Amino acid sequence: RHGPNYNQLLHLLNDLQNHNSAWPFLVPVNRDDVADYYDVIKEPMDLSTMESKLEADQYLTPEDFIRDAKLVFDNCRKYNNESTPYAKSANKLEKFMWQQIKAIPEWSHLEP
């Protein structure tokens, strides 16, 4: 049923969700708690939404998956100031994501 990249993409998403820096990114921001978030961030993304999209076969290539992961990290660095804790968390999680990708032989063509 799923395409050839599904197992490694689920492995990567599992790695992301289990990383110690991932907590701020596990679920969508709640507008009831952060009133201006969806005025600032036009294309929101989070790891639970990525999980649902992966299940629905929206990621055919690692490139499709990485584009959504980049939204997670870039949105966080747009909303939060440089050098603040959440910007640092986004930097740490993105760096970890790329360490994991570089370890997958079939994904050697990919680069940040």
Side-chain angles (χ1 to χ4, degrees), residues 1 42 47 63 68 70 72 82 87 101 103:
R1 19 137 5 146
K42 295 310 181 203
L47 298 175
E63 287 96 331
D68 269 355
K70 202 171 181 307
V72 173
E82 181 167 350
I101 292 166

Side-chain angles (χ1 to χ4, degrees), residues 2 8 19 21 32 39 47 49 67 73 80 91 95 103 109:
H2 294 303
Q8 280 301 351
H19 188 279
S21 287
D32 303 334
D39 300 324
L47 298 175
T49 299
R67 188 164 274 289
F73 310 134
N80 297 283
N91 292 337
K95 183 182 162 204
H109 55 293

Side-chain angles (χ1 to χ4, degrees), residues 70 98 102 110-112:
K70 202 171 181 307
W98 276 107
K102 284 149 150 200
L110 304 167
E111 56 181 287

Side-chain angles (χ1 to χ4, degrees), residues 28-112:
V29 167
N30 192 339
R31 189 178 344 240
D32 303 334
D33 309 328
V34 190
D36 70 336
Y37 184 79
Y38 293 103
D39 300 324
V40 174
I41 301 307
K42 295 310 181 203
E43 192 165 4
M45 199 31 69
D46 66 276
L47 298 175
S48 290
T49 299
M50 293 189 60
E51 181 170 358
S52 298
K53 290 184 66 170
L54 176 67
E55 280 305 287
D57 298 303
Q58 304 300 299
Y59 303 132
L60 303 193
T61 57
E63 287 96 331
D64 298 326
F65 178 101
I66 286 146
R67 188 164 274 289
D68 269 355
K70 202 171 181 307
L71 269 179
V72 173
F73 310 134
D74 289 347
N75 291 343
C76 172
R77 289 183 297 244
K78 173 185 183 172
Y79 188 83
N80 297 283
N81 295 340
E82 181 167 350
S83 311
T84 60
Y86 274 24
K88 287 171 179 162
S89 296
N91 292 337
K92 288 191 289 263
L93 191 53
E94 190 161 26
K95 183 182 162 204
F96 169 75
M97 180 184 76
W98 276 107
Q99 159 188 283
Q100 299 307 93
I101 292 166
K102 284 149 150 200
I104 308 302
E106 57 256 48
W107 290 353
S108 65
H109 55 293
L110 304 167
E111 56 181 287

Side-chain angles (χ1 to χ4, degrees), residues 10-27 46-52 54 65 93 96:
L10 192 74
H11 177 209
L12 180 59
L13 181 58
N14 190 70
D15 283 341
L16 293 185
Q17 286 193 21
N18 275 285
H19 188 279
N20 255 38
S21 287
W23 191 82
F25 311 115
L26 289 174
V27 297
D46 66 276
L47 298 175
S48 290
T49 299
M50 293 189 60
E51 181 170 358
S52 298
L54 176 67
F65 178 101
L93 191 53
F96 169 75

